[model samples]
Target: GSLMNIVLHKEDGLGFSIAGGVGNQHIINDNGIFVTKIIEGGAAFQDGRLEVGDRITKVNTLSLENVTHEEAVAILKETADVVSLVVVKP
Candidate 1:
């Protein structure tokens, strides 16, 4: 796996549109699971479950280690219909 660095620009704001089968991997704290980036004003954001700097550690209890992006996506999508991410707040 490779480490990705992202800095959101104004145009990049378009990127925060939705979370689904394909999305950015976010992190909360150092030890938490990799979280999904929030869709601006979406349910996840409005509910306050999704937040910046949240490290999502597991998707349906599957550890996000040594997995490819495609594989991770599959697991995440499989975990739940709503796709809840396990995260630790930084």
Candidate 2:
């Protein structure tokens, strides 16, 4: 139902991150949402641009200043459901 995309910019470079898990329905049923740690060796990681614990403050120019994590995610799926991120190399 939702998808996320990450674009690679040779100039900005890339960072490394794991396919973090999603917390959703399944807790009550003892199922809880589950996510696996997948290899995310995109340009970000390959270029050592993004690092672990680097919070994603703004996505696609959307200020995540006063938004819930769930809400922010929804916005992302609405606009960047495909997979593309504009960020600077850290």
Candidate 3:
């Protein structure tokens, strides 16, 4: 479980997007928040650090252990100009 820190500014339409897969009701189940999709030419993709399977464990200092996909998205939207994320590659 290697942790990665990423900062995303509100650009290119909220910077990035995510999904929990069709089987999980858009919620982070056994696996954490999965980076299902990345907007091309966007802040996240431009950073060239995020991957499809990267599991987001935290937004800033808030733990996303059992948070729903909607909740996680909400956190990002409510976050300041720059969003700090703790991601775990698995």
Candidate 4:
């Protein structure tokens, strides 16, 4: 797996789906944030680098380390236009 630092900008939305977040009662407790899907014709698909199952380590200065699902979504959406992602493909 290779680690990649990519800058992506979306026109209307984040252009991807994600899962796996921190919680005591949730199924996903400690695993990193996951990039599960890259929507067709979306910014991520157009970027040509990010793939399904990619681990999202960060969004800008926000860390995905042990982040909850709500926190992850809000953080990402806060900077959807100019999203800077640190990803690892496994």
Q: In angstroms, how far off is 54's CA in candidate 2?
A: 0.9
Off by over 4 Å in 4: 24-30
- Model 2: lDDT of residue 45: 53
In order, candidate lDDTs are 0.44, 0.39, 0.73, 0.81
Q: Model 1 over residues 1-90: C-alpha lDDT tens digits?
A: 323322222221212221222233333222223454677655455555556545445555576555555666566555433444455555
Residues 1-90 of candidate 2: C-alpha lDDT, one tens digit per residue: 222334544323223332222333312432211222223665555544344433343456664334554664564455522335433222
List runs of model 1 lying over 4 Å from the truth: 1-36
Q: What is the lDDT of residue 17 in candidate 3?
A: 63
For model 4, residues 16-69, the per-residue Cα lDDT tens digits are: 988878762123445678887889999998988888888888899889878778
Best by TM-score: 4
Comparing 1 and 2 on lDDT, the stronger one: 1
The 10 consecutive residues of candidate 3 with the worst lDDT sum are 20-29
Model 3 scores a TM of 0.80
lDDT of 4: 0.81
TM-score of predicted model 2? Answer: 0.39
Cα lDDT for residue 38, candidate 4: 87
- Please, what are the lDDT tens digits per residue for candidate 3 over residues 24-84? 5444346367777888888888788888778788888887767766677777677776778
In candidate 2, list every pair of residues with a backbone clash: 5-83, 5-84, 14-43, 14-44, 14-45, 15-44, 15-45, 15-50, 26-32, 27-32
RMSD of each predicted structure: 10.4, 9.9, 3.0, 2.3
